[PDB]
Each structure stands twice: as C-alpha cells, then as structure tokens.
Amino acid sequence: GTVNWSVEDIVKGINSNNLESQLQATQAARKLLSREKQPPIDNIIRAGLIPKFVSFLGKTDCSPIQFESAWALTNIASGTSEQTKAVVDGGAIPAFISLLASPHAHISEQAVWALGNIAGDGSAFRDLVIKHGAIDPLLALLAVPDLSTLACGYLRNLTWTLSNLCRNKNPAPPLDAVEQILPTLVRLLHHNDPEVLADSCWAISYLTDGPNERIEMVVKKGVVPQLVKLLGATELPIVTPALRAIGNIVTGTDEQTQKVIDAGALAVFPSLLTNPKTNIQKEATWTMSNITAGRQDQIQQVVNHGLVPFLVGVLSKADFKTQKEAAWAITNYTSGGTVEQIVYLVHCGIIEPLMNLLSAKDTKIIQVILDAISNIFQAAEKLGETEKLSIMIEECGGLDKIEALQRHENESVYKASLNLIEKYFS
C-alpha cells in the first residue's frame, strides 16, 4: 500500500491536486521517516516536501492527513539542528500550536511531540515556541481534576515537551514562562506514573540549574519534600533527576540548602553514597561537598546522620571523579567546621585515605587535599596535638608523599608541601 515508496513517488502523489492521492503519499512519507535505520530525512527535505506537509497541518476537513504530516514533520524535527530548522523555516510552529486544540487526541498529541522536538533543539527555538504562544494551549490540556483520566502516553508526551520548555541555559527560559509552567509541573511531580515522574524531575533539575533566584522560584513552590521522597524511589530513572535537582538546590543559599536538610534528605545518603551506579555516587558526593560547604549546624547534621564514615568510604574506594568530590567534601568540611567537628573527622579515619589520594596525578585534587591537611593541623594547633597528627600522617606513608610533592611542576603543590614540612615535620 504505502510501504517502501520511493521519494520520487511521494513527490508525485503530494504534487497531484487530489487530496486522497496526497494523503496516501504523505502516509508513505511518514512510513519512510519512521524506520529506525537511516530514515531519508535529507532526501525528503531536498524534495521540497516540508512546505506541503506544513500546509497539510491546516486541512481540518481531512484529519488523517493532519496526523500523517504531523508525524512526518515530528520525525524530521527529531534530527539534527539543520533538519529541525527546516521544519521551523517552513512555518510549522504556529501550525502545530493550532493543532494542540484538535478534537482528535492523537493529532494534538502528535503536535505536542513535534513542539517538544523543536523546543528540544535549543534555547532559541525553545523561546520561539514560547513566543508563538505554545504554553497556554499545552497547559490547558492538563487542566483536568485528575491527571489519571488522561491517556498514559498522552500525559508522558505533554510532560516531556514541558520539560524541554524548561531545558537549556544560555539563556535560561523566560522567568514568566517558568512561573506559568511551575504549578502544572508541581502537579505532575505528584503523579504516579514513573515516566511522568522522571521527566518531571528532569524539568525541575533544569529549572534549579542556575542562579539562586532560579532555585528560589522552585524551592518556594514547596517541591523539596516531594523531591526527597522521589530520591528514595526504586526506579533509577527517577532517582537520577531527583538527585540532580536536590544537588542543584544545595548550590544555592544556606537557607535553600537547609530546606533540603529539613525535608530529611540526609537519611537517604547512606544508600546514595554506596549506590552501585557510579554516577549516583558522584552526584551524591558532590551534593555532600556542597552541604559541608554550609554552616556549622549543617555540618553537624552531616555528622549526626553518620555520613562522615560514608565519606571516608568513598575517599577510600570509588571512581576517581567521585573520590575528588569526596576530597572537596572534606576540605569544605574543614574550612567551616568547628575544632570538635574536625577532630571527629580524624577519629573516623579520614587521614590515611586522604594521604593515599596524594598519589593522584590530578593537580587540583592534590591542592584540595593539602588545603584539608593544613586546616586539620590548624585544628590540632588549637589543642596542642600537632605532633600526634604528624606521627599519624608519617605512620601511613603520608609524609613521604608530602615530602615528594616539593618536586612538583605546579608551584603551589610545592609551596604548600614544604610549608607543611617546615611547620609540622621539623
């Protein structure tokens, strides 16, 4: 029927003045574009078919050709930037926004999908979709008393497209667009579908990846407890964006960070800092490093929750990039912590895994670790216990590492190494 048409035949049918001939040719184009291996997107673009597809979007009296061209344009728009641009250049954005109000659910869903692809290209096309007025019709489709009455696949497509309207950072989405979208996002964050939840958290993670004012717009909508709950989900596609969102929020103020602590997030971190997926461990340790960069009462909550032994853990054994986040977590801890808090670090065994990491060739992690050691020695000076710590560093081979680092190509590796030796290893 419409399987395995040549492009030349598709053009012949679309160029006839017979709507039914154009419908069959358009469906055949859709089927070509739907195959997984190397769909002839450029061949379809080169044949001048995009203006015709866009024109078919407006044929209200023939909804099948609206659907077939919507699907075809969706798949062209799903390619490279140049391929998405060709769809935009053909006038597709307002035609797709007009289809959002279609009485045919499968047609409006396809328009939702298509706009998601166009917005997904980047901030310029994202903001152009916003300027054409897409947000109001999109949100109207979710203005129902109970989300559960909407078709699952429909709801997932709306959520995903909304997440693209929140994505990308230079520039971030318009402030008023984010405010318009947020209450619907909050509602989707409480839905029970795992895919809606994953994409909802992805959207929140994009919105919190910016300055503190962007974080605050999200935080004051009250989503932090729900994010913490999703942090404990069994589905890793939910935990990853939830954790990215939580970690983003703790890059903000101590007040915004405190709301993460208040919501009970630290109790999840024994699992996160031992999580088998290496990227979860990295994100969780980075998150921890920004919490230990906070106030002393926030460092105390890390201590209370038993998380210092888990930092000793990842410092002792983890992927290197996670180990460097753990080094940062320690140095931040030692910069803001009390004497008692810093002494507790030593009691948990931080010193030897810290010393072993001075074997690394990463120059910045060596600077990080030497800053931590200096801060710990400063805590030892206020107690008259500098030498008990020097023998501890010497007994685990740490002194041999600090002494060797005086011959390092960076000129503050040495200049911190020799000062440590000059002052504490006389």
């Binding site: 503190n212 970690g247 703790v250 890059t251 903000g252 103020t253 101590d254 980075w286 490093s289 920004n290 960069a293 906070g294 940062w328 931040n332 910069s335 803001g336």
Partner: peptide, 9 residues
Amino acid sequence: ANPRKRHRE
C-alpha cells in the same frame, strides 16, 4: 551568597 559552593564539574 555562599562562595564555597561549587557548581557541577
């Protein structure tokens, strides 16, 4: 507000 905070690397 807090200069000790680090963005993602």
